[PDB]
């Protein structure tokens, strides 16, 4: 049971229910795939590189360093 090679050469059913293309060829992309993929790449780039690089401007940060300052001036 734990040594015999399996019978299913390839997983049952095609992925996204699409037949594999002709041999020596490639899956021709639809008219929407390229714009959607460049959009999804630019979204990740902008969010990862923009949100992590924008300054930490917030009311939970300025107020934190103002309270941490007035909390010690009381002594």
Partner 1 sequence: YFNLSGLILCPVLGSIILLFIPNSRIRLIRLIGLCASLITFLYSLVLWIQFDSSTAKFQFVESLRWLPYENINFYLGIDGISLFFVILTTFLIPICILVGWSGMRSYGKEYIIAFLICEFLMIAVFCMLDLLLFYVFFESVLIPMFIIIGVWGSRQRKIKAAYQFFLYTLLGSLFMLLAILLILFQTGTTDLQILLTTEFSERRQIFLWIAFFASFAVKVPMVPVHIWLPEAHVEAPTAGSVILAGILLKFGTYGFLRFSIPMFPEATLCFTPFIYTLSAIAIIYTSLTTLRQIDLKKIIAYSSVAHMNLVTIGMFSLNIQGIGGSILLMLSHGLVSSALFLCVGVLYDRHKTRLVRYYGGLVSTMPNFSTIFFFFTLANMSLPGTSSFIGEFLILVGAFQRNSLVATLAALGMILGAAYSLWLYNRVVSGNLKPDFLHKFSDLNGREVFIFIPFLVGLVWMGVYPKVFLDCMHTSVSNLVQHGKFH
Partner 2 sequence: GDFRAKVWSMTGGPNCRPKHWRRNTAIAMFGVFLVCIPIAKLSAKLEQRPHMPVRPIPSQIWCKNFGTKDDYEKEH
Partner 3 sequence: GRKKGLPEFEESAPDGFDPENPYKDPVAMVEMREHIVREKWIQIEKAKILREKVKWCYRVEGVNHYQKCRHLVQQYLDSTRGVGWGKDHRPIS
Ligand X SMILES: CCCCCCCCCCCCCCCCCCCC(=O)O[C@H](COC(=O)CCCCCCCCCCCCCC)COP(=O)(O)OCCN
Q: Applying CB under 8 A, which part among 1-9, 23-31, 32-40, 43-51 lies near partner 2?
A: 1-9
Q: Do 36 and 43 touch, CB atoms closer than 8 A?
A: no
Which residues, 11 to 70, sit near partner 2 by CB under 8 A?
11-17, 68
The Cα–Cα gap between 28 and 36 comes to: 15
> Quick one: which segment of 2-10, 19-27, 34-42, 53-61 binds partner 2 (CB under 8 A)?
2-10
Planar angle of CA 36, 51, 68, nearest 5 degrees: 165
**Residue 60 interacts with partner 1 (CB under 8 A): yes or no:** yes
């Amino acid at each position: 049971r734990w040594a015999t090679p399996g019978h299913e050469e390839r997983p049952k059913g095609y992925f996204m229910n699409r037949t594999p293309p002709a041999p020596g060829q490639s899956r021709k992309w639809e008219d929407w795939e390229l714009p959607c993929y460049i959009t999804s790449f630019l979204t990740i780039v902008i969010l990862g590189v923009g949100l992590n690089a924008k300054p930490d401007l917030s009311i939970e940060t300025w107020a934190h360093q103002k309270a941490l300052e007035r909390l010690e001036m009381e002594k």
